[PDB]
Design a protein around this ligand. Structure first.
Ligand code: CLA
Ligand code: CLA
Ligand code: CLA
Ligand code: CLA
Ligand code: CLA
Ligand code: CLA
Ligand code: CLA
Ligand code: CLA
Ligand SMILES: CC1=C(/C=C/C(C)=C/C=C/C(C)=C/C=C/C=C(C)/C=C/C=C(C)/C=C/C2=C(C)CCCC2(C)C)C(C)(C)CCC1
Ligand SMILES: CC1=C(/C=C/C(C)=C/C=C/C(C)=C\C=C\C=C(C)\C=C\C=C(C)\C=C\C2=C(C)CCCC2(C)C)C(C)(C)CCC1
Ligand SMILES: CC1=C(C/C=C(\C)CCC[C@H](C)CCC[C@H](C)CCCC(C)C)C(=O)c2ccccc2C1=O
Lengths: 141, 75, 80, 31, 75, 37, 729, 39, 139
């Protein structure tokens, strides 16, 4: 939630990793609980040795973290489905991003809310003449 | 390419003494010219059982067969 | 950020949620289809606009739309 | 029969005020 | 590869090929154009792509007539 | 290169002005403007 | 971030694309945050005055440079052999050959020979000395300052025009037909008869002279009473010399018909009488629409009354569609301007109305090609603003069952028939060209298909050309339309039968095939543009294109993958077609007139029927003097056009990079360049404020389109100018 | 050969046989009667 | 017309003495030189084609024109009615990928009744579909 507990995996070091945006604007951090000491391909580049137990990996974009989560959930026979993706600011605060409700978004649970859901078809969208100078969008209003 | 644009512009501006020609500022390819000198000096010094060179494009006489030129040295 | 609007033609097939590689879509409960669920996009500030959810959808003129609006560091996908 | 230098300088001076007036138009078109 | 074969064709028909004369003098096909006129883009256009394409252009009613309607075909 | 017309001294200073002095201060003012907040 | 001020969504992204998108949406005032309906019109009005002052500064600059650095006083002494001068050359990069070759037309300074028609214009207007057109340059500077002050004062809240003033269509159509098109043509006919015709008669009329002498010795009273034949009492005979008093009978409005035999131009009295006869009809037609006075017409009752059985609801509820929107008005304005600009081009080479402009062949060629390349632009922009109107400003609930909605209801019939017409012309024009080119390649040019263009030759037959022998309606002298006793019979007949001028040129068998080629380019460009405008709202792929806007990159790789799905991308392809067909007609025009001016008409009549004749006798033969603008030996005055030739080739191929390669490659490359700048030691001091990204998809499409366009235009303005200035200069 | 009759009746082989027959009768008509610009 | 016929044109009579032999027949240029004599030529010596519609020059244009208007209509009818008779057998997709070559040969032979069949299909209403039952695009 606010503190990241984990060890860095065995990796020699790469060039496509954390650039100067990490210590300035934001970075991301994936934490998961392994079973054995297997090998995984990080989206930064090359392969790395996944450490045994709870390990922590710092990445630069959220898409790399979700691509690693896809690689952890599909490309292993002990399917690692207990990973947590946090967003780390340079101020020190840590925001729990995924799977923050607690259950995966692919299945439904009670406690979520329908954000960004329309009550019409796309053919029932309004025309851009009646809202020509309101400043809004033809899909929003 | 900017060498080609530069002497294109120096020829278009009527100043041929500022181009990259041979009479102008000359960029002599000294390394391949030295390699051609070694290939011309090869038979007798570094290839003693060879009569002629590896080719007549490095350096040597002009080979003429039927009124045409087979291979002359390419400076 | 872009605007991911999800219309009422969604049949709850949850293909768009498992296709999006950024965790913006998620299935919320509903009562308008056989599957009794509809996709929803709360985390629209993380959507890059890749329209990978508008490749796996079975309805005619797919029930989820991604309107490419403003851009930021997340929506442009920059690691620098 | 050709022009004089004072006619060229008078042309520059009489075209100086369109520069000020276009600067005024550009300023009020920005705001 | 288009620039490589252009450099090959022009250098070999300006500095290598041509007829030979019995006194030893060599006259080339394009009379030595590569020395001072291969350094310009206009020199590559005028002295190579305009001057040597005339044999493709003016060859109608002859044996080299299919090459004209392959020239325009490739364009 | 000279000028047979009247005021030949004037392009001698107007060509470097519109070539260098006008675009350098225009790009300087525009880069100060479009990158400020 | 302050830039851009108008857009809030572009003032917040840290990327470098907000500078480009702030540049290219600076004039789209509809997508500005915080702009109401009337502020749109008021900002348009002030920007209109800014443009109308820029065009006066440009005309004043042309006038000032002909006054200052031009040999205008030495050009009127012998305008058949000496060359006009645009301006002088002051770049410091000139060597000695580029100064010894650019001191042309008798001037010690390096000059630049003018190829626009400003000298023949200013001589036909009546300007003789440099002082009066310098005074015209100062007058245009003051007039440009006047319109700049109008643009400033029409932004104050006191003098701010209301929205109902801009919606007042009938109270400005009257003034644009009478007080802008009529009384200004009336003032131009007045300037013609007062200054232009007496300077063609030798009498120097100035501002201190026109109040004293009358243009006609009979006075103003024969116009007030009647019997106007004394205004055409004695015209200028065939033995008249321009600018002098030699055989020049004074009569101000003489309708002759045909050409002046000395200047190969129209009679200036005929020009003045024509402008009077158009000013009268324009002031008459300006009193049509209803204003504060109850007499006139209101356009709502005219449009609502034009119904029909096959038409549908007619033009009902259509005045509000044009008057509320602005892209509909801009599309109609650009369409009418494009057709009349090509009308300018087609009537400034066959009916020249300037002194000795039919002999300066490079000037006529440059002016014709310039106006055709403007007309193609304006036609493409008319259809582009039609697509913008269909995206933004079209509502189907108000335009119900009228001609616009019924146009949209059968768009799959329209663009499929345009697809048929395009394939019909294209398959067989290319089929006949390849058939001709093969049979000439096989040494048998008698097997060519040379279809005689009998329809156009029939039009020349009913125009006056008795060459083809078709005795129909004007070439037959006993016809009904020939024996009417009108004024334009003998002069126009001898002008159209003279085989020296460029009026109604002898149409041979090649012009059949090339005019089918221009019909091909016109139909295909109309196909892409109408398909863009009618599918601007939607189609079977995405029927929410009204919701996405006009220009947007794609809709992802799904549903097949909709690259180039917007109506902006139909403009994109149609821009290449407009450049292509304009290149076709201008290659055709320039080769025809190179056969006419040199007297070797048989070269164009024999070689144009197959494609290698175009590739040999036009592109290969006429460009021999262009590429020899700088040899290793010497440099002549055509060196700047050889450099512009290669420059145009370079920009035309630079657009290929943005066209062929797409964004994702360049983004992956820019990631590596960003890494190299962030890990270079001594360049870690200098860091960007805005994050550098690649150019966007629609953006770099537009950049590659711009390079294709200006590369095309620069290499053709190099070749078209230098080839006919090397042949005739 | 219950599959050879289907393979010889696919679209490319049938359009190539039809274009071979069309080019054959066109070349034969152009050999026995050459150079016909009109009728 | 202003064009001289090939029977008396001086440039054509100068060019006909050395017409090239196209086929293997060594007298092909001479028989072409007397075949093209009926046509009319301009000032270059090449046979032009009058296309105005006058029947005295219909052999230039109209006689091959309707000849093509048969054969194209033949191909069009053979391509149309065949699709109709594979609108259902069991599956039209494979019958469009591989050809039912006896059915195709039957249509290819029977296609020479195409214009009377075209007026018959236009009168029976089975040629032009209705404007409402056609799958149009949304406006
Ligand atoms: C020389 C290049 C070239 C050619 C031939 C074409 C040809 C065509 N374009 Mg086109 N186009 C081009 C460049 C070209 N384009 C470029 C650079 C652009 C800018 C991106 C466009 C953009 C463009 C648009 C946007 C559209 C077209 C369309 C068309 C078609 C209708 C126009 C026409 O004239 O009818 C027909 C003319 C022809 C010349 C067709 C004959 C082609 C060959 C000779 C047929 C012979 C068969 C061939 C030999 C079989 C090959 C066998 C081989 C496998 C061994 C036509 C096929 C339109 C279209 O398809 O819809 C109708 C359309 O909407 N074009
Ligand atoms: C728009 C018309 C126009 C154009 C294209 C040119 C072009 C040129 N002028 Mg020029 N000029 C113009 C109007 C124009 N002038 C007017 C109206 C005047 C009267 C004041 C002058 C007075 C003038 C002098 C005195 C000289 C030139 C010179 C030159 C040449 C070098 C550039 C330079 O130093 O200019 C600099 C020009 C100025 C400082 C004053 C003119 C500025 C005008 C009024 C602004 C034009 C507004 C323009 C449309 C804005 C474009 C906006 C667009 C980018 C969006 C160049 C050919 C020089 C020359 O001949 O060198 C060989 C030179 O010595 N001009
Ligand atoms: C459009 C305007 C323009 C103008 C007027 C010039 C002018 C010049 N260029 Mg140039 N150039 C231009 C555009 C222009 N260029 C562009 C767009 C490019 C890119 C393709 C180039 C690329 C280029 C190259 C690659 C070279 C030149 C060179 C030259 C110079 C040739 C003589 C020389 O060595 O000068 C000597 C140098 C100078 C006169 C520099 C100016 C220093 C002045 C005198 C000091 C004044 C400063 C003063 C203290 C401040 C006064 C304050 C003010 C308010 C009064 C000449 C001054 C050549 C050169 O050697 O220039 C360095 C050269 O090699 N140019
Ligand atoms: C290294 C090569 C080089 C360079 C630097 C130049 C430079 C120049 N030449 Mg030149 N020239 C060259 C080679 C070169 N030439 C060659 C090889 C030839 C053939 C022999 C010529 C032939 C030639 C002629 C015949 C003439 C020149 C002239 C000029 C001057 C242009 C006057 C000016 O500043 O207008 C200002 C420049 C422009 C308006 C062009 C820029 C257009 C921009 C890119 C588009 C607009 C961008 C944006 C919308 C607005 C700007 C943004 C900015 C304000 C922030 C300039 C000094 C002219 C001259 O002496 O001046 C009167 C002239 O008449 N040249
Ligand atoms: C007598 C009164 C009068 C006059 C003279 C004008 C004049 C004008 N109005 Mg205007 N207006 C008027 C009354 C008048 N208005 C009234 C009463 C209203 C009440 C609602 C308006 C409302 C109005 C609006 C809302 C707008 C204008 C605009 C304009 C300007 C656009 C015309 C232009 O620049 O091209 C003038 C073009 C020509 C004169 C000729 C047209 C082209 C011809 C047909 C081509 C063929 C011949 C050609 C000239 C040959 C060229 C040869 C070459 C050598 C030169 C123009 C200055 C617009 C503006 O602000 O633009 C600055 C605009 O948006 N007006
Ligand atoms: C009467 C003329 C006229 C007017 C008033 C407009 C007005 C408008 N058009 Mg438009 N248009 C026109 C003609 C016109 N157009 C024509 C003739 C075409 C066809 C070519 C178009 C094609 C067109 C498109 C495709 C679009 C518009 C759009 C627009 C709107 C916003 C424009 C904007 O922000 O541009 C901002 C200005 C720019 C981007 C500048 C680009 C132009 C540069 C100068 C070209 C570069 C040339 C280069 C520098 C030359 C180099 C020379 C040398 C140095 C080598 C605006 C209402 C847009 C719209 O409504 O939707 C958003 C839109 O998408 N127009
Ligand atoms: C619009 C397309 C078109 C049309 C109407 C024709 C029409 C004709 N061609 Mg032809 N041809 C075409 C395209 C076309 N061709 C193309 C694209 C090529 C290149 C492959 C040829 C190559 C060609 C040859 C090689 C010959 C013809 C010949 C002929 C003529 C007699 C044909 C025949 O078999 O009898 C006829 C007038 C023949 C002839 O002698 O013409 C008089 C002949 O020998 N054509
Ligand atoms: C034989 C079937 C057939 C028929 C009856 C038609 C009929 C038609 N097509 Mg067409 N078309 C066909 C096949 C066919 N097409 C195929 C296979 C293609 C892909 C190359 C096209 C591509 C096409 C385009 C792009 C366009 C048409 C258009 C049209 C209409 C105008 C006439 C025309 O230009 O056709 C001329 C036909 C062509 C240019 C292409 C067809 C050429 C092939 C060789 C014909 C034979 C096809 C097939 C092999 C024969 C089947 C025989 C069967 C026993 C297996 C007309 C209704 C136009 C339209 O919309 O009109 C409003 C139009 O723009 N067609
Ligand atoms: C899309 C769109 C659009 C656009 C369109 C356009 C762009 C169009 C154009 C069009 C055009 C461009 C047209 C034109 C045409 C014209 C014509 C067609 C004319 C004709 C005329 C006549 C016919 C006359 C007659 C005559 C003759 C011919 C000769 C002799 C004389 C006389 C006079 C008798 C708009 C804007 C609407 C908007 C909406 C959408
Ligand atoms: C004679 C002649 C001529 C004339 C012509 C004309 C003028 C034309 C017109 C045309 C037209 C005016 C047309 C119309 C049409 C329409 C329509 C409507 C059509 C129809 C069609 C269809 C319907 C189709 C069908 C089909 C067939 C038939 C077969 C195959 C299949 C199909 C299906 C394709 C000329 C001068 C050139 C020359 C001389 C001769
Ligand atoms: C090269 C290239 C790039 C890379 C483009 C980059 C990195 C832009 C770099 C531009 C440099 C800085 C030159 C810009 C200066 C020009 C002279 C324009 C002047 C600036 C104007 C504002 C006047 C793309 O991003 C791209 C995207 C989609 C399709 C094709 C392409 C493509 O071809």
């Amino acid at each position: 939630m606010t503190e990241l507990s984990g060890q860095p995996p065995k990796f020699g070091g790469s060039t496509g990793g954390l650039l100067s945006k990490a210590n300035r604007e934001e970075k991301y951090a994936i934490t998961w609980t392994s079973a054995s000491e297997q090998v995984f391909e990080m989206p930064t580049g090359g392969a790395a040795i996944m450490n045994e137990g709870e390990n922590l990996l710092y990445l630069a974009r959220k898409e790399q973290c979700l691509a690693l989560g896809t690689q952890l959930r599909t490309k292993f026979k002990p399917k690692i489905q207990d990973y947590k993706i946090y967003r780390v600011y340079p101020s020190g605060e840590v925001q729990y991003l995924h799977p923050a409700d607690g259950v995966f978004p692919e299945k439904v649970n009670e406690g979520r809310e329908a954000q960004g859901t329309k009550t019409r078809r796309i053919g029932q969208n309004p025309e851009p003449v009646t809202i020509k100078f309101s400043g809004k969008a033809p899909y929003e209003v | 390419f900017g060498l080609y644009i530069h002497n294109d512009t120096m020829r278009a501006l009527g100043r041929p003494q500022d181009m990259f020609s041979d009479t102008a500022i000359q960029l002599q390819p000294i390394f391949a010219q030295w390699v051609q000198h070694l290939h011309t000096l090869a038979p007798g010094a570094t290839a003693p059982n060879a009569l002629a060179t590896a080719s007549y494009a490095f350096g040597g006489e002009t080979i003429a067969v039927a009124g045409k030129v087979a291979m002359m040295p390419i400076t | 950020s872009h605007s991911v609007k999800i219309y009422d033609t969604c049949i709850g097939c949850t293909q768009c949620v498992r296709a999006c590689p950024l965790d913006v879509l998620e299935m919320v409960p509903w009562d308008g289809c056989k599957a009794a669920q509809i996709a929803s996009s709360p985390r629209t500030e993380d959507c890059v606009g890749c329209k990978r959810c508008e490749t796996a959808c079975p309805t005619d003129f797919l029930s989820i739309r991604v309107y490419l609006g403003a851009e930021t560091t997340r929506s442009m996908g920059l690691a620098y | 029969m050709a022009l004089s230098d004072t006619q060229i300088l008078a042309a520059l001076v009489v075209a100086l005020l369109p520069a000020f007036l276009a600067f005024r138009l550009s300023t009020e078109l920005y705001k | 590869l288009s620039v490589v074969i252009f450099h090959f064709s022009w250098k070999m028909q300006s500095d290598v090929w041509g007829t030979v004369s019995p006194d030893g003098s060599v006259t080339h096909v394009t009379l030595g154009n590569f020395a001072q006129s291969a350094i310009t883009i206009n020199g590559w256009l005028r002295d190579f792509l305009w001057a040597q394409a005339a044999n493709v252009i003016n060859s109608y009613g002859s044996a080299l007539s299919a090459y004209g309607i392959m020239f325009l075909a490739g364009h | 290169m000279d000028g047979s017309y009247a005021a030949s001294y004037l392009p001698w200073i107007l060509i470097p002005m519109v070539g260098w002095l006008f675009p350098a201060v225009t790009m300087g003012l525009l880069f100060i403007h479009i990158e400020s907040e | 971030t302050k830039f851009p001020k108008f857009s809030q969504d572009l003032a917040q992204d840290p990327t470098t694309r907000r500078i480009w998108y702030g540049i290219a949406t600076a004039h789209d005032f509809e997508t500005h945050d915080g702009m109401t309906e009337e502020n749109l019109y008021q900002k348009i009005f002030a920007s209109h005055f800014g443009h109308i002052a820029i065009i006066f500064l440009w005309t004043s600059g042309t006038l000032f440079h002909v006054a200052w650095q031009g040999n205008f006083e030495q050009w009127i002494k012998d305008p058949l052999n000496i060359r006009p001068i645009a301006h002088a050359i002051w770049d410091p990069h000139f060597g000695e050959g580029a100064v010894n070759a650019f001191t042309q037309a008798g001037a010690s300074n390096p000059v630049n020979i003018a190829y626009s028609g400003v000298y023949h214009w200013f001589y036909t207007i009546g300007m003789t000395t440099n002082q009066e057109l310098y005074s015209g340059a100062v007058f245009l500077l003051v007039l440009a300052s006047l319109f700049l002050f109008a643009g400033w004062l029409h932004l104050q809240p006191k003098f701010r025009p209301s929205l109902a003033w801009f919606k007042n269509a009938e109270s400005r159509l009257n003034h644009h037909l009478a007080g802008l098109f009529g009384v200004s043509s009336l003032a131009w006919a007045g300037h013609l008869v007062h200054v232009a015709i007496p300077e063609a008669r030798g009498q120097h009329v100035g501002w201190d002279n026109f109040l004293s002498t009358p243009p006609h010795p009979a006075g103003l009273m024969p116009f007030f009473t009647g019997n106007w034949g004394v205004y055409a009492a004695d015209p200028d005979t065939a033995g008249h010399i321009f600018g002098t008093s030699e055989g020049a009978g004074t009569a101000i409005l003489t309708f002759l018909g045909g050409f002046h035999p000395q200047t190969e131009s129209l009679w200036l009295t005929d020009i003045a009488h024509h402008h009077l006869a158009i000013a009268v009809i324009f002031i008459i037609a300006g009193h049509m629409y209803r204003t504060n006075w109850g007499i006139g017409h209101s356009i709502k009752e005219i449009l609502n009354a034009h119904k029909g059985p096959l038409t549908g609801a007619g033009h009902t509820n259509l005045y509000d569609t044009i008057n509320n929107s602005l892209h509909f008005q801009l599309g109609l304005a650009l369409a009418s301007l494009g057709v009349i600009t090509s009308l300018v081009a087609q009537h400034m080479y066959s009916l020249p109305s300037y002194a000795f402009i039919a002999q300066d062949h490079t000037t006529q060629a440059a002016l014709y090609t310039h106006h055709q390349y403007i007309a193609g632009f304006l036609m493409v922009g008319a259809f582009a603003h039609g697509a913008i109107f269909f995206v933004r400003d079209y509502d189907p609930v108000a335009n119900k069952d009228n001609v616009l909605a019924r146009m949209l209801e059968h768009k799959e019939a329209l663009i499929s028939h345009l697809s048929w017409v395009s394939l019909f012309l294209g398959f067989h024009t290319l089929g006949l060209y390849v058939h001709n080119d093969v049979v000439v390649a096989f040494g048998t040019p008698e097997k060519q298909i040379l279809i005689e263009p009998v329809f156009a030759q029939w039009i020349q037959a009913t125009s006056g050309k008795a060459l083809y022998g078709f005795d129909v309606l004007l070439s037959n002298p006993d016809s009904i339309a020939s024996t009417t006793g009108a004024a334009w019979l003998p002069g126009w007949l001898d002008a159209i039968n003279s085989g020296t001028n460029s009026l109604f040129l002898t149409i041979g068998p090649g012009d059949f095939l090339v005019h089918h080629a221009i019909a091909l380019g016109l139909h295909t460009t109309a196909l892409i543009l109408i398909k863009g405008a009618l599918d601007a709202r939607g189609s079977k792929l995405m029927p929410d294109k009204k919701d996405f806007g006009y220009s947007f990159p794609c809709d992802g790789p799904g549903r097949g993958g909709t690259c180039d799905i917007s109506a902006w991308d139909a403009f994109y392809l149609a821009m290449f077609w407009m450049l292509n067909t304009l290149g076709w007609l201008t290659f055709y025009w320039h080769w025809k007139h190179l056969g006419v001016w040199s007297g070797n008409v048989a070269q164009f009549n024999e070689n144009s029927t197959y494609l290698m004749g175009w590739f040999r006798d036009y592109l290969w033969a006429n460009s021999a003097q262009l590429i020899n603008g700088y040899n290793p030996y010497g440099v002549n005055n055509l060196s700047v056009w050889a450099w512009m030739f290669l420059f145009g080739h370079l920009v035309w191929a630079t657009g290929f990079m943005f066209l062929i390669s797409w964004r994702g490659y360049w983004q992956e490359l820019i990631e590596t360049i960003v890494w190299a700048h962030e890990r270079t030691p001594l360049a870690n001091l200098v860091r960007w404020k805005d994050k550098p990204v690649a150019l966007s998809i629609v953006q770099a499409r537009l950049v590659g389109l711009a390079h294709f366009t200006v590369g095309y235009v620069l290499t053709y303005a190099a070749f078209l100018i230098a080839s006919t200035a090397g042949k005739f200069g | 050969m219950d599959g050879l009759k289907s393979f010889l009746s696919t679209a490319p082989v049938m359009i190539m046989a039809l274009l071979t027959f069309t080019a054959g009768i066109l070349i034969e008509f152009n050999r026995f009667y050459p150079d016909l610009l009109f009728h | 017309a202003n064009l001289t016929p090939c029977s008396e044109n001086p440039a054509y009579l100068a060019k006909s003495k050395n017409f090239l032999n196209t086929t293997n027949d060594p007298n092909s240029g001479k028989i072409r030189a007397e075949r093209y004599a009926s046509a009319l030529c301009g000032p270059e010596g090449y046979p032009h084609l009058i296309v105005d519609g006058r029947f005295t020059h219909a052999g230039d244009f109209l006689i091959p024109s309707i000849l093509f208007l048969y054969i194209a209509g033949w191909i069009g009818w053979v391509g149309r009615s065949y699709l109709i008779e594979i609108r259902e057998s069991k599956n039209p997709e494979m019958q469009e990928v591989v050809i039912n070559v006896p059915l195709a040969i039957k249509k290819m032979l029977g296609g020479f009744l195409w214009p009377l069949a075209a007026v018959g299909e236009y009168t029976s209403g089975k040629l032009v579909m209705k404007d409402s039952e056609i799958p149009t695009s949304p406006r």
